[PDB]
Amino acid sequence: EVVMTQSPASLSVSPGERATLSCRARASLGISTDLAWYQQRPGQAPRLLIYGASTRATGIPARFSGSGSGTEFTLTISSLQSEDSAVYYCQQYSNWPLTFGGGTKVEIK
Amino acid sequence: DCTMYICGDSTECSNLLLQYGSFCTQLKRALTGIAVEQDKNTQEVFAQV
Amino acid sequence: ETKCTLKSFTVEKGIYQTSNFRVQPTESIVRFPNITNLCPFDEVFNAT
């Protein structure tokens, strides 16, 4: 099947500093920009961040930005606030082992 | 030799070749007859003394 | 074996071409290229 790795395990940056998340998938051929990013605050249900490689869905603040193609994908966030403290995921809708990311718990300094 | 010429030392080919009967017992006899005739031909000409 | 070839029980004097002899193999060897990674067939047959 297709299993992706989400590193670092837990980010730690101060507010006002850009935070970069990398989600890489172990695929011989790749995913071809068929990746999505998710946010799960404790309590309520998770909310989508970005569908596809770069484009954002309706209702997403300008603080989220996505990048990467082929096999390496990097997500960058600018101007962090207190509401950004949540577990971040990444799923690839390319093959049919439909699964989520390994789990990243970003921390605010 | 039919077995080597027709079949490349394969067991299955020989097993299928046995199904045809005696198509080489006749072929292997004409050549021996020709060889015996050739051996007699040279003797009928020179061996006269 | 000559009697078996002639399909009889009494063979007359002469020289006969009975059969053929061949040398049997000793062992079997196998040679393949050095490849270890698995083929990515799951992407082809499982496509979104």
**What is the Cα–Cα distance from C17 to B29, expressed in whole angstroms?**
10
Task: Enumerate the domain spans of chain A.
Answer: 3-108
CA A76, distance to chain mean position in Å, is: 9
| Contact criterion met (CB < 8 Å) for C17 and B3 | no
In 3D, which of A70, A101, A109 has the Cα closest to residue A7?
A101
CB of C25 within 8 Å of a chain A CB? The answer is no
C33: its two tokens = 């290229």
The SS3 of residue A10 is: coil
Residues A74, A67: contact at Cβ < 8 Å? yes
Give chain C's radius of gyration (CA, Å). 29
Q: What DSSP element (H or E) covers A19?
A: strand A19-26
Q: CATH class for domain A3-108?
A: mainly beta
User: What does this entry list as its resolution, in Å?
Assistant: 3.5
Residues paired with residue A65 on neighbouring β-strands, in sequence order: A76
Assess B9–C contact: CB distance below 8 Å, yes or no.
yes
Cβ distance C20 to B3 less than 8 Å, yes or no, reads yes
Q: Following DSSP, what letter does each residue of C1-48 receive, concatenated?
A: -HHHHHTSS---SS--------PPP-----------SPP--HHHHS--
